[PDB]
Design a protein that fits this description.
Helix content is about 45%, strand content about 10%. It is of the alpha+beta class. The strands form three sheets. It has a six-stranded antiparallel β-sheet. The chain has a three-stranded antiparallel β-sheet with strand order 6-8-9. It has a two-stranded antiparallel sheet with strand order 7-10. A hairpin with a 2-residue loop joins strand 4 and strand 5 (about 235-240). Helix 3 (about 30-35) crosses helix 4 (about 35-50) and helix 4 (about 35-50) crosses helix 5 (about 50-65). The longest helix is centred in the middle third of the chain and has 19 residues, at about 260-280. Bound molecules: ligand A1AQ9. The site of ligand A1AQ9 has 26 residues, from strand 1, strand 2 and strand 3. This is G protein-coupled receptor kinase 5. Interacts with ST13 (via the C-terminus 303-319 AA). Interacts with TP53/p53. Interacts with HTR4 (via C-terminus 330-346 AA); this interaction is promoted by 5-HT (serotonin). Interacts with HDAC5. Interacts with GIT1.
């Protein structure tokens, strides 16, 4: 349901309006052709025109399909690619991957199959595209079209850019509504942080820390920031919408309480990928509890409440003693200097709670005081039941190691060490990260699951940076606004908006 005049809101500017953009955007190949969705599509579209580049795009697509292929169907897919791209007499031949690597790839086909068989060829193809093809695309009309899309991206976001529907939750500094972008009709989750209370509580820095952390990470399994704007009475964070409920509700109201080990495996695998994406930024979450894991319309999960996340400088440690009683790692309860370890402790808490239907250190049917709960966390070894396989027991007690130094995932390897644990032995993380594995529970669509200081002005400005680049471009693509507006001249000619004559 896009606005009636949406083709006028997202109307392309004349290319003459984008010269300031042309000369400031860093001409980085990975950024302009891969990281940014619309740039990636436009570069691929450019390669579609030249006959020599089309084959390389098709090959990369087939390698992307190969890496997520089922294990027992690997050799079948690999040989196909070989007969189509790596054969010298093929109509679609990869010429820049010389024979000195075609032969190596054929040796691996003569041997076992690995999901990274075509990694060498794919990187060689990329090493070729970053050269002449990329610099030709920079002087092509498709990069001028990309500049037009960036011009729209940088436009100012106001309250009139969205329309709010209903209030879906309350919090500490404000509330959470459900807004929609009028021009594209995409739903979001508005997070109103009301100004008066931020300045009274002197928690300005925390709002910027959460906003910056949210706009940085671009994970499939953490709520993403799409817009950060300001109104006459609040600061708004437009985040991913999650209508599927929260994991606490499904553990206790929908559960046994608890899930089957396989169901918990799926949710744990997605939470681990979320924590991994966060730790790629040396950002620790510290707020892992079942109610913070939200489900979407499809059944997948994301980590939601980033109000307690902070970015650890590389090589640094921090102090805190923050979180929720029962989900605080011993190093946090002791108020020590820690790194990312609280999140792996939380992952242990989550896996245990999903399988067993209660926290590892307090019973569902137990009336205990915070003092005793903490004492158990610091001194008591959790017990396990027949609901846990041996692998499930293993990963849980390894993640629940009191000594953050010996805790799983807290080595130089990081989340890698966790993905390798035998508890995920039957989990294909490549397919999971690609959204290829079916979630174990799909929420029903219709379901309902539940002043003049001027220093404030400077704070206003650094917060409200506007639309976030990758989420914005993805929004454009999903709502099909890109497919509709991204039209050129008939038969490869220039459209009027891209011709510097007759502006
Ligand atoms: C299915 C259904 N039926 C009913 C019936 C009645 C009521 C609800 N529902 C739902 C339901 O799930 N609603 C819902 C939807 C769609 N999204 C969310 C929340 C989020 C979302 O999507 N993305 C983030 C990111 C980050 C947060 C987050 O940090 N929150 C904390 C506490 C917070 C801190 C400070 C604040 F000022 C405000 C909040 C929350 C969210 C909720 C709660």
């Amino acid at each position: 349901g896009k606005s009636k005049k949406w083709k006028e809101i997202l109307k392309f500017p004349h290319i003459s309006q984008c010269e300031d953009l042309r000369r400031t955007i860093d001409r980085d190949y990975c950024s302009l052709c891969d990281k940014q969705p619309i740039g990636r599509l436009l570069f691929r579209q450019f390669c579609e025109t030249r006959p020599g580049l089309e084959c390389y795009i098709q090959f990369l697509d087939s390698v992307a399909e190969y890496e997520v292929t089922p294990d027992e169907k690997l050799g079948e897919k690999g040989k196909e690619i070989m007969t189509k791209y790596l054969t010298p007499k093929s109509p679609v031949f990869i010429a820049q991957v010389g024979q000195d690597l075609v032969s190596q790839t054929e040796e691996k086909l003569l041997q076992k199959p690995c999901k990274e068989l075509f990694s060498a060829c794919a990187q060689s193809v990329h090493e070729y595209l970053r050269g002449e093809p990329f610099h030709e695309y920079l002087d092509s009309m498709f990069f001028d079209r990309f500049l037009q899309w960036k011009w729209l991206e940088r436009q100012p976001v106001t309250k009139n850019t969205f329309r709010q529907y209903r209030v879906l939750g309350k919090g500490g500094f404000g509330e959470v509504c459900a807004c929609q972008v009028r021009a594209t009709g995409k739903m979001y989750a508005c997070k109103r942080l009301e100004k008066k209370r931020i300045k009274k509580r002197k928690g300005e820095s925390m709002a910027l820390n959460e906003k910056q952390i949210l706009e940085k990470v671009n994970s499939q399994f953490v709520v993403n920031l799409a817009y950060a704007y300001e109104t006459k009475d609040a600061l708004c964070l437009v985040l991913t919408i999650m209508n599927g409920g929260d994991l606490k509700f499904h553990i206790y109201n929908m559960g046994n309480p608890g899930f089957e080990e396989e169901r918990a495996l799926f949710y744990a695998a997605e939470i681990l990928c979320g924590l991994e994406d966060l730790h790629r930024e040396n950002t620790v979450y510290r707020n892992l509890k079942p109610e913070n894991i939200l489900l979407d319309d499809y059944g997948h999960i994301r980590i939601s409440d980033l109000g307690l996340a902070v970015k650890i400088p590389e090589g640094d440690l921090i102090r805190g003693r923050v979180g929720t009683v029962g989900y605080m790692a011993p190093e946090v309860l002791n108020n020590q200097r820690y790194g990312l370890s609280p999140d792996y402790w939380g992952l242990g808490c989550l896996i245990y709670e999903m399988i067993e239907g209660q926290s590892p250190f307090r019973g569902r049917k137990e009336k205990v005081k915070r003092e005793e709960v903490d004492r158990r966390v610091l001194e008591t070894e959790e017990v396990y039941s027949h609901k846990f396989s041996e692998e499930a027991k293993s990963i849980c007690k390894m993640l629940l190691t009191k000594d953050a130094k010996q805790r799983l995932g807290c080595q130089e390897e990081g989340a890698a060490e966790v993905k390798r644990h035998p508890f995920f032995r039957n989990m294909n993380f490549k397919r999971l990260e690609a959204g290829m594995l079916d979630p174990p529970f799909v929420p029903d669509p219709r379901a309902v699951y539940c002043n003049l200081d001027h220093t404030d002005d400077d704070f206003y400005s650094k917060f409200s940076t506007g639309s976030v680049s990758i989420p914005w471009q993805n929004e454009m693509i999903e709502t099909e606004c890109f497919k509709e507006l991204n039209v050129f001249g008939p038969n490869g000619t220039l459209p009027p908006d891209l011709n510097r004559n007759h502006p």
